[PDB]
C-alpha cells in the first residue's frame, strides 16, 4: 500500500523494549563505548519476538525503501528540552532512547561513525542549530534539505540510515524517493550505469562543522574520481547520488543530460514520511534517497530532534578506512 514496510509495537511490546534499553543504560557507561558496541547485537536478541521477526523478514524483502517501527513511548517531561547544539545533546533524558536505537540497529548490521562528523560519534543528533537555517546540512531548517544518498561520495557509506524521532511537534516530513525506473528510457539508463559522474563529500564532513582524516575529505572534494550513479540489476538498481553535490564528468554532455533527467524525475516522485515522536525509520541507503522538508525552527526548547545512526552489513568491507578504530571511518 505504501513504499515502505511498517511495524507497530503493541503497548506491551513497547514497554518491554523500553525496559531493556533502560537496563542497558544502567549497566553501560555510554552508548558507543567499546563494551556496548560489542554487546548490543546479542542483547538485542532479547527484544520482543514479533519485532525480531519483522526485522529479519523485512530486511530480506526486495521492495521497501525503509523499515518503519512505530509506537515507542517518549515522555516530553522526562526527555527535557531540545539541545541547542549536538555537542551537548547527550542529555540524561535522551539516554535510554539512544540505547534503544542501538539495540534496534543491531538487528540490522554493524554500526559505525565518521571521524569527520560530530566528533566521531556513532549515535549522532539531528536538530536545528541557530544561525544554520540556510545550510546544506541536517541542522538546517528554513532551507529544504535536498535529497541525497547518505555519504554518497564514499564507497564505505551505510547500507541503512537509522532515525529515531525524539520529538516532531509540527510534523515535519522526511522525504524519500526510489529509482524512477518507470520513466527512464534504456539509453539514459545505460549512461547512469557508467562511471561518468563526480560525487563530492557534503558539508557535514567539513572542519567547520566539527569541534588527519580531514585530508581524505579534501582530496575527495578536490579531485573526485568518476563513479556510476546506478549499479547492480538493471530491473532493480542500487542508487548513489546527491542532488546538491553531484555533477557530470567535465565536458561529458551525455552524462549531464542523464543526470539532468534523473534530477527532474526524482523531484517529481519525492514523497513524504512523517516520523512522529517515538517513530524509528531505517532507510535503505541503496534503494532510496532521502531529505527533509523546510520548516520554521522554534528555538524555544521543543524543536524537532532525532537521533541518527549509520549501519553497514559488513564492517570489514571498510577496513582500509578504519581510523585507528573499526567503528570510526576516515
Ligand X SMILES: N=C(N)NCC[C@H](O)[C@H](N)C(=O)O
Q: Which of 106, 128, 146, 297 binds ligand X (CB under 6 A)?
A: 146
Rule CB under 6 A: say whether 252 interacts with ligand X: no
Residue carrying the nine cell digits 527484544 = 47
Residues 6+ apart with CB under 8 A from 238: 230, 231, 232, 286, 287
Choice between 16 and 265, CB closer to ligand X: 265
- The single residue among 59, 65, 95, 148 that binds ligand X, judged by CB under 6 A, is 148
Binding mask 178-207 for ligand X (x = CB under 6 A): ------------------------x-x---
Total chain residues near ligand X (CB under 6 A)? 13
Q: How far is the CB of 15 from ligand X (least distance, A)?
A: 31
* C-alpha angle 202-163-233 in degrees, rounded to nearest 5: 70
Residues 6+ apart with CB under 8 A from 175: 147, 270, 271, 272, 273, 290, 291, 292, 293
Binding segment for ligand X (CB under 6 A), chosen from 3-11, 19-27, 134-142, 175-183, is 134-142
- For 38-95, the DSSP string reads HHHHHHGGGS-HHHHHHHHHHTT-SS-SEEEEE-----HHHH-SPPSSSTT---GGGH
45 has binding-site annotation: no
Residue pair 117/126 in contact (Cβ under 8 Å)? The answer is no
The option from ligand X, Fe ion, none interacting with 242 (CB < 5 to 8 A, set by class) reads ligand X
Nearest CA-CA partner of 262 in 202, 179, 328:
179
- Does 154 bind ligand X (CB under 6 A)? Our answer is no
In the bound state with ligand X, the residue whose beta carbon lies nearer, of 81 and 143, is: 143
84/136 with CB nearer ligand X: 136
Q: State the nearest-atom distance from the C-beta of 51 to ligand X, in Å.
A: 26
241-259: b or e for each residue (b if 16 or more CB lie within 10 Å)? bbbebbebbeebeebbebb
The residue within the footprint of ligand X, chosen from 15, 137, 206, 257 (CB under 6 A), is 137
Q: b/e string for 172-181 if b means 16 or more Cβ within 10 A?
A: bbbbbbbbee
Binding mask 81-120 vs ligand X (x if CB under 6 A, - otherwise)?
----------------------------------------
Structure letter (DSSP) for residue 137: S
Nearer to Fe ion, 196 or 308 (CB): 308
**Residues of this chain, 215-244, that bind ligand X according to CB under 6 A:** 242-244
For position 149 contacting ligand X by CB under 6 A, the verdict is no
Cβ pair 41, 134 in contact under 8 A:
no
For residue 304, say whether it is annotated as part of any ligand binding site: yes
Q: Rounded to the nearest 5°, which phi and psi values hold at 329?
A: -100, 150
290: annotated binding-site residue?
Answer: yes
Q: Are strands 238-239 and 145-148 parallel, antiparallel or unpaired?
A: unpaired
Give the cell for residue 310. Answer: 549509520
Q: Say if residue 174 carries a ligand binding annotation.
A: yes
Question: Stretches 27-35, 54-62, 65-73, 135-143: which one binds ligand X (CB under 6 A)?
Answer: 135-143
Rounded to a whole number of angstroms, the minimum distance from the CB of residue 177 to Fe ion is 13
Judged by beta carbon, residue 13 or residue 150, the one nearer Fe ion is 150
Residue number, 242 or 252, with CB nearest to ligand X: 242
Other CB atoms within a 10 A radius of the CB of residue 203 amount to: 15
Query: Segment 138-197, which members bind Fe ion (CB under 5 A)?
Result: 150
Interface with ligand X by CB under 6 A: which residues?
136-138, 145-146, 148, 150, 202, 204, 242-245
Question: Residues annotated in the binding site for Fe cation, as ranges?
Answer: 148, 150, 290
Question: Residues annotated in the binding site for 2-oxoglutarate, as ranges?
Answer: 174, 304, 308
Amino acid at each position: 500500500v505504501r513504499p515502505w514496510s511498517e511495524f507497530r509495537l503493541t503497548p506491551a511490546e513497547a514497554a518491554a523494549a523500553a525496559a531493556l534499553a533502560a537496563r542497558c543504560a544502567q549497566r553501560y557507561d555510554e552508548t558507543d563505548g567499546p563494551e556496548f558496541l560489542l554487546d548490543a547485537p546479542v542483547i538485542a536478541h532479547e527484544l520482543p519476538r514479533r519485532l525480531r521477526t519483522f526485522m529479519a523478514r523485512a530486511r530480506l524483502d526486495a521492495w521497501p525503501h525503509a523499515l518503519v517501527v512505530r509506537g515507542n513511548p517518549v515522555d516530553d517531561a522526562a526527555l527535557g528540552s531540545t539541545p541547542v547544539h549536538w555537542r551537548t545533546a547527550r542529555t540524561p533524558g535522551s539516554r535510554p532512547l539512544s540505547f534503544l536505537l542501538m539495540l534496534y540497529a543491531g538487528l540490522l548490521g554493524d554500526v559505525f561513525g565518521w571521524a569527520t562528523q560530530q566528533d566521531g560519534r556513532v549515535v549522532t543528533d539531528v536538530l536545528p542549530i541557530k544561525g544554520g537555517e540556510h545550510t546544506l546540512v541536517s541542522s538546517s531548517s528554513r532551507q529544504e534539505l535536498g535529497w541525497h544518498t547518505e555519504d554518497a561520495f564514499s564507497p564505505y557509506r551505510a547500507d541503512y540510515v537509522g532515525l529515531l524521532s525524539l520529538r516532531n511537534p509540527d510534523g515535519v516530513a522526511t522525504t524519500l524517493a526510489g529509482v524512477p525506473l518507470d520513466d527512464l528510457d534504456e539509453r539514459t539508463l545505460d549512461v547512469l550505469f557508467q562511471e561518468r559522474f563526480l560525487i563530492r563529500p557534503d558539508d557535514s564532513h567539513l572542519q567547520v562543522n566539527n569541534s588527519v582524516e580531514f585530508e581524505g575529505i579534501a582530496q575527495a572534494a578536490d579531485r573526485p574520481e568518476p563513479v556510476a550513479i546506478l549499479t547492480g540489476h538493471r530491473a532493480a538498481p542500487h542508487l548513489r547520488v546527491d542532488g546538491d553535490f553531484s555533477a557530470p564528468a567535465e565536458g561529458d554532455e551525455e552524462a549531464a543530460a542523464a543526470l539532468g533527467t534523473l534530477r527532474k524525475l526524482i523531484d517529481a516522485s519525492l514523497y513524504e514520511l512523517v516520523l512522529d515522536q517515538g517513530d524509528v525509520a531505517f532507510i535503505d541507503n541503496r534503494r532510496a534517497v532521502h531529505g527533509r522538508r523546510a520548516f520554521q525552527p522554534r528555538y524555544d526548547g521543543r524543536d524537532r530532534w532525532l537521533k541518527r545512526i549509520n549501519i553497514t552489513r559488513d564492517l570489514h568491507r571498510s577496513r582500509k578506512a578504519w581510523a585507528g578504530d573499526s567503528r570510526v571511518l576516515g
